Structure 1
Amino acid sequence: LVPRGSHMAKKVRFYRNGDRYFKGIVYAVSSDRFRSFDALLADLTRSLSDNINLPQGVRYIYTIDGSRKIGSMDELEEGESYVCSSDNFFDDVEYTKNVNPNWSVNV
């Protein structure tokens, strides 16, 4: 087992800034799966970038409403959605429209 973290994978959904027709990619995030926050950013750059999206790669992770930036894997919350950005501009588009909402825990 890796000697860092909790070992419990966090299921999170990643969107790419300004793209209204992007599904989001569901990641199982843990220290066993990603060496560091940087390895997660590198992985996200490869999965989310294209010739029209994230030209400088994934360098910022915002909360779904763009209120706050995430700076560690610890800051990510299970069942939450995040927006990946190449810069400091959060694009207010309908990311969450026409997506399956995650299972909300009742008990």
Structure 2
Amino acid sequence: MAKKVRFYRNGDRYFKGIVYAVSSDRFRSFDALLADLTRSLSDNINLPQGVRYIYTIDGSRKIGSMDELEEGESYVCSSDNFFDDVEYTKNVNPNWSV
């Protein structure tokens, strides 16, 4: 079963998040998910090196596998090891998944 999650772009206060359905049957590896997020989140300023790392919404945890993603949660995609502490979910409907 795919997990429905919401991805945001490191450092971008104006992006409202992209909803993904994530499972190993569609993404053959974690690298394939990273590649597809590089495609959809394409932004030369905030993602200069594409999507190389995924963090929880608050930056507390680095996600290393699709198994670590959880239904209904939000995550931040980054080109590097620096998580930019901005209010990603400001003014986004907390019930976007309802």
Q: TM-score, normalised by structure 2?
A: 0.93
Q: TM-score, normalised by structure 1?
A: 0.85
Structure showing greater Rg: 1
**More RCO (CA 8 Å, sep 6+):** 2
d(CA) in 2 for partners of 1:62, 1:30: 18
What secondary structure sits across from 1:74 in the alignment?
Answer: helix
Measured after TM superposition, the shift of residue 50 of structure 1 is: 1.9
Which runs of 5 or more residues in structure 1 are unaligned? 1-7
d(CA) in 1 for partners of 2:58, 2:87: 10
Matched residue count: 98
CA contact (8 A) 1:42 1:58 kept: yes
Measured after TM superposition, the shift of residue 51 of structure 1 is: 2.2
Identity %: 100
d(CA) in 1 for partners of 2:88, 2:96: 18
d(CA) in 2 for partners of 1:63, 1:21: 18
Indicate the structure with greater helix content: 2
CA contact (8 A) 1:13 1:26 kept: yes
d(CA) in 1 for partners of 2:12, 2:79: 13
Which runs of 5 or more residues in structure 2 are unaligned? none
How large is the RMSD of aligned CA atoms in angstroms? 1.8
Measured after TM superposition, the shift of residue 92 of structure 1 is: 0.6
